[PDB]
């Protein structure tokens, strides 16, 4: 008595993280008088646009098409077939390294959780998009000469090759850039086929 709670939780672990990859260890609270476990919270969360609305979801539902033979556990072959349905593929080794980024069995537990923490890399849309907006004097169009003079000199010095390559693809409406649209050419709904 005062026991039937704490007995029964030893199930939870069996279909989640614990066996599959115990990096994130849990902590079980309750003392023998149960009213004292109430200092064990989960408090504080939404910083910015973490699982970005146009990226994250349409992946988890897609799983049934990636899970080929319908087990939950994507082998290197379940990958091998699905990329053959897409268009371009990586070699075995190139995929074998993605397998090595995970602790092994890319299954419905593992795949999702190895996605779940990875939020750093790209910048959120507003942040990139505001760059020439917080630069024009009060809304006209920003001169491609100033941009060419900056990237070369004032900061990390980009190369002749790096600059004019990234330059070329530019909606240049008469000497000034359509900034937001080139920002969209940097980030938007667009280029597949890259993982997973």
């Amino acid at each position: 008595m005062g026991d039937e709670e704490k007995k029964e939780k030893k199930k939870k672990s069996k279909k989640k993280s614990e066996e599959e990859g115990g990096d994130a260890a849990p902590a079980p609270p309750p003392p023998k008088p149960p009213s004292q476990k109430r200092r064990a919270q989960r408090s504080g969360s939404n910083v910015f646009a973490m699982f970005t609305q146009h990226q994250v979801q349409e992946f988890k539902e897609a799983f049934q098409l990636i899970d080929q033979d319908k087990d939950g556990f994507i082998s290197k072959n379940d990958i091998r077939a699905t990329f053959d349905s897409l268009g371009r593929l990586c070699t075995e080794q190139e995929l074998d390294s993605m397998v090595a980024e995970a602790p092994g069995p890319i299954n419905f537990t593992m795949f999702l959780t190895i996605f779940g923490d990875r939020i750093a890399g790209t910048d959120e849309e507003d942040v990139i998009v505001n760059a020439f907006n917080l630069f024009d004097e009060g809304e006209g169009k920003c001169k491609e000469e100033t941009l060419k003079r900056s990237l070369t000199t004032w900061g990390e010095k980009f190369s002749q090759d790096e600059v004019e390559e990234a330059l070329s693809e530019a909606p240049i409406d008469g000497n000034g850039l359509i900034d937001i649209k080139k920002f969209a050419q940097i980030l938007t709904k667009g280029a597949e086929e890259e993982g997973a």
């Binding site: 910015f48 646009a49 609305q53």
Partner: protein
């Protein structure tokens, strides 16, 4: 009995509670009375004016009350439940639903979709159907104003 003259109706609706003859006078728009005689015979018409005068007002009482009594209506059911909480107040603040549901909601784009999608067409059409009438009137009467 149906409808009566514009004028000939008034002398019975004066002379009903008698009203002293000298001390009233008929006119065309303005009606003329004396001091004294009028006023308290005009309070007396509350004690006397039953039937239609108080039945318009009473129908308006029933009009109002049928829609708008409120107040006592959901009280009993809530009140029993207040007790169902009050017997447990020492627990209450230690509970489940509190605040984890919130901060993302200013950042997302087209949030309450589906239901507002079933609403969408009617919402588009009738707002315009209204802005058709809810322009045109004052709106033409601007020229008429000038």
């Amino acid at each position: 009995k149906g409808f009566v003259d514009a004028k000939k109706v008034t002398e019975a609706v004066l002379g009903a509670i008698q009203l002293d003859a000298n001390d009233y006078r008929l006119g065309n728009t303005k009606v003329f009375f004396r001091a004294g005689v009028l006023g308290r015979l005009e309070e007396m018409r509350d004690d006397r004016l039953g039937k239609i005068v108080t039945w318009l007002q009473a129908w308006i009482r029933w009009y109002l009350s049928k829609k708008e009594f409120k107040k006592l209506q959901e009280q009993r059911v809530a009140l029993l439940v207040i007790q169902r909480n009050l017997r447990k107040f020492l627990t209450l603040r230690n509970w489940l639903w509190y605040k984890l549901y919130i901060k993302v909601k200013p950042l997302l784009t087209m949030a309450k979709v589906e239901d507002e999608l079933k609403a969408l067409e009617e919402k588009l059409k009738k707002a315009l159907e209204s802005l058709e009438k809810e322009e045109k009137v004052r709106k033409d009467i601007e020229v008429q104003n000038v």
